[PDB]
Amino acid sequence: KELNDLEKKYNAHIGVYALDTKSGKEVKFNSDKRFAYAATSKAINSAILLEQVPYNKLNKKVHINKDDIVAYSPILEKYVGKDITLKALIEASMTYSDNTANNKIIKEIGGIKKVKQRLKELGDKVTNPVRYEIELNYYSPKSKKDTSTPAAFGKTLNKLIANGKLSKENKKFLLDLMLNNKSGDTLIKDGVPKDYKVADKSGQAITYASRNDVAFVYPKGQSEPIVLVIFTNKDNKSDKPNDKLISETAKSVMKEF
Amino acid sequence: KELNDLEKKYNAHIGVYALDTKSGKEVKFNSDKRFAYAATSKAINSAILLEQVPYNKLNKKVHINKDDIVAYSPILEKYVGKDITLKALIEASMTYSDNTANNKIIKEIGGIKKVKQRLKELGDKVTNPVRYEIELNYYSPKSKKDTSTPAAFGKTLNKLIANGKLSKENKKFLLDLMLNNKSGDTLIKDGVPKDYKVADKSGQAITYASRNDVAFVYPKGQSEPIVLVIFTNKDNKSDKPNDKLISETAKSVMKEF
């Protein structure tokens, strides 16, 4: 379970930050090294929008046209020239990792700048959103663009969602999407003990086998979640990642709690 | 609401079969004309597998290798060389319309032949599965391959799921996937009245703007569903469909109940 020999077994780099929100106990490993967060940022944008729009007001529609459309939008693809509710945008973003949905949410929030401002209010000076989908995924170890550290990103998830200011309804709406999500089943969920419940949002950048998973993990018997951010990448641009790496990382970290 | 002037407004062909399972009242329109059912068949395969595997036994894993992988498998893509539960296969098939998941389910059932045999036991001599994903989507008006009529397909959905022999748990597991599904939101769900609950599985063949949606529709106040099959296509191979066509078709048909 040493994270060091997980990096060896897999020849990858692991960035972890786990915070038991009950005890405040943290597990860090390369927790201050930057990683491209890819689709895991969708959790952040969704949370931020849910801060400014009451659950009852998620039924508000927003028009989607061709310009809004970006690659890998299994849901939003068909909304060209149609309206979609803020509620359905968030579901598309969280369940399907829909790229057009996420951009739209960011737009609704006020843009990247607004996202940045918010991050800064949350005391997050590390999380660096610079581009929208899908370009936020063109990770370069040379660039800080669209990257965060496991610690900065974890602290933000905590402050925004776990110990945030979301209403009961919106927090539930969001955590349930991440809970019900079957997309990151091979990641944190795969490595945690049978009885734990995992509310995650996976992600994978285009380069360096940047494969991430962030989650609200709930040990059987605990209602308070452990915020778990696992970012992983490899040395080469075209490197393919191994999800079992995240699964094994979550297994190990969870044993700390 | 005449279906005829919906076909005019949209210059498309509508195939409908609605059966109120409570009253046994039916609404038909070109209900005996063949249409490519595309991903809507996933509902059928899932139901059939759920007939032979108890809910508690869905945790059984099945190995996925490269050969199993077909196009548009947002979930199953990453399972190459990994195991997946029958439960996660069905979720992938129903929520994400995952093609590799569906093929695997068909394999688990015993193959297309087995599916055929089952259809025949259900008194369905029309539904004609011939290929797996993704080729089942190469629709030709000249070919009966992978097509069914709205009536034959509707009667099968009814006999297999609605008035089928699924256990409480499996029927729920499946209907909840279709209920929670945000993929066909622009279809039946878009056209039914606000308070209705729609448990659907959309679909779109590669050709002739073959855009379908099948659902278990629940009027507010009714627990028994109305099985609604709406198949639509156009004259030309490269025709793009308009989902609002299905939405408007569902609106009209629902007024019959």
Swiss-Prot record, chains A, B:
InterPro entries: Beta-lactam/transpept-like, Beta-lactam_cat, Beta-lactam_class-A, Beta-lactam_class-A_AS, Membr_lipoprot_lipid_attach_CS. It catalyses: a beta-lactam + H2O = a substituted beta-amino acid. It comes from Staphylococcus aureus. Coiled coil: none annotated. Keywords: Antibiotic resistance, Hydrolase, Plasmid, Signal, Transposable element. The active site is at A39 (acyl-ester intermediate). This is Beta-lactamase. The class A beta-lactamase family has a specific amino-acid numbering system, sometimes called Ambler or ABL numbering and often misspelt as Amber. A multiple sequence alignment was used to derive a consensus sequence and then the consensus was numbered taking into account insertions and deletions. This allows use of identical numbers, e.g. for active site residues, despite differences in protein length. UniProt always uses natural numbering of residues, hence there appear to be differences in numbering between this entry and some papers. The keyword Acetylation does not apply. Substrate binds at K201, S202, G203. Transmembrane segments: none annotated. Gene3D superfamilies: DD-peptidase/beta-lactamase superfamily. Belongs to the class-A beta-lactamase family. Pfam families: Beta-lactamase2 (PF13354), LPAM_1 (PF08139). Its EC number is 3.5.2.6. GO terms for biological process: beta-lactam antibiotic catabolic process; response to antibiotic. GO terms for molecular function: beta-lactamase activity. The gene is blaZ.
